[PDB]
Amino acid sequence: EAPNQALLRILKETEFKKIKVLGSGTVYKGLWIPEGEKVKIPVAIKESPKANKEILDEAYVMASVDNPHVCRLLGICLTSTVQLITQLMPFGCLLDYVREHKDNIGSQYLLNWCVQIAKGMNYLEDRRLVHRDLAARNVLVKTPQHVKITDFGLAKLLKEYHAEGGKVPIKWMALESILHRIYTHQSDVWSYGVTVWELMTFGSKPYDGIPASEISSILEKGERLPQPPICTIDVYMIMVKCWMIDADSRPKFRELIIEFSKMARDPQRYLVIQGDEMDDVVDADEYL
Numbered sequence: 485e486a487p488n489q490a491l492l493r494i495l496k497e498t499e500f501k502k503i504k505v506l507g508s509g510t511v512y513k514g515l516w517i518p519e520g521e522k523v524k525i526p527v528a529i530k531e532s533p534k535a536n537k538e539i540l541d542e543a544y545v546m547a548s549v550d551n552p553h554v555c556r557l558l559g560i561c562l563t564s565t566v567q568l569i570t571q572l573m574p575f576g577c578l579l580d581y582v583r584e585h586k587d588n589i590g591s592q593y594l595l596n597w598c599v600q601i602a603k604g605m606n607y608l609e610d611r612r613l614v615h616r617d618l619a620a621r622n623v624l625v626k627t628p629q630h631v632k633i634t635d636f637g638l639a640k641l642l643k644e645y646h647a648e649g650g651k652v653p654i655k656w657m658a659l660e661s662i663l664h665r666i667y668t669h670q671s672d673v674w675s676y677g678v679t680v681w682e683l684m685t686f687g688s689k690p691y692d693g694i695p696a697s698e699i700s701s702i703l704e705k706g707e708r709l710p711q712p713p714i715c716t717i718d719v720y721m722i723m724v725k726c727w728m729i730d731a732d733s734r735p736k737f738r739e740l741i742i743e744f745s746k747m748a749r750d751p752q753r754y755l756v757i758q759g760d761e762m763d764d765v766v767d768a769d770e771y772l
């Protein structure tokens with residue numbers, strides 16, 4: 485158990501401008517200007533004692549991660565509403581993005597999102613972190629060519645995690661987790677499988693028209709999400725393996741990287757889609 489020497493940066497509130505509300509749990513668009521640095525960083529600003537301790541837990545995890553497919557923490561601002569400041573992801577969450585652009589999303593984009601998400605998750609596994617809330621809504625889009633995993637509030641650091649009775653997304657959850665509140669990197673792989681299904685259906689809702697309470701018995705009887713129309717058996721077999729009952733039968737993220745990478749070199753063999761064929765601004769990824 486190695487010492488976590490990550491730096492937590494406190495930001496002066498006078499160092500940034502809130503341009504606009506992005507969504508609302510409120511997120512703002514903004515510009516961070518470290519004083520006398522002559523850079524402007526576009527940022528997202530996520531703005532009760534319980535609220536404060538939970539948001540500081542998230543800041544803790546986000547400050548201990550540094551990977552190109554993991555969300556970046558720039559710093560915090562100490563106010564009574566205690567803001568998280570991160571890199572601005574100008575295209576929003578990936579689930580809204582596939583819903584909005586489904587008629588122009590080709591197989592190349594789909595398979596490389598799958599690669600990049602697997603890279604993010606494999607990195608979180610290397611740092612012994614279990615995300616516990618992986619879903620297309622929690623993947624942000626920096627560019628159509630570059631996505632990052634976000635939302636580490638539920639994440640817990642480590643062989644298994646025994647949780648309490650807080651509210652949980654049953655439809656993205658492994659079955660061990662629904663029944664026994666157990667979470668592992670392999671229960672994260674299950675959520676990855678639902679995530680890929682979300683993408684391949686262009687953002688359909690898993691088990692739509694079913695309440696969370698029946699899900700556990702459905703999965704016990706052997707039922708799974710259907711094969712998306714665009715999906716070859718090759719791709720759909722990968723989802724199904726992510727949904728094995730035996731968690732060590734599920735793929736590892738490093739294996740998922742390899743498989744989707746192979747498929748990304750010939751994407752039309754694996755997905756069938758009709759028609760597939762401010763001067764001082766600095767991106768946060770370049771401000772080190």
Ligand SMILES: *CCC(=O)N1CCCC[C@@H](n2c(NC(=O)c3cccc(C(F)(F)F)c3)nc3cccc(C)c32)C1
Nearest residue numbers: 506507511528530570571572573574575576577580634
């Ligand atoms: C699926 C919901 C969605 O589109 N979101 C999530 C919540 C609202 C913000 C939306 N948005 C952003 N977000 C971010 O840039 C961002 C960065 C880091 C962390 C977070 C988080 F998780 F805390 F919320 C958000 N950027 C844009 C740009 C344009 C449009 C939208 C809607 C947008 C994304």
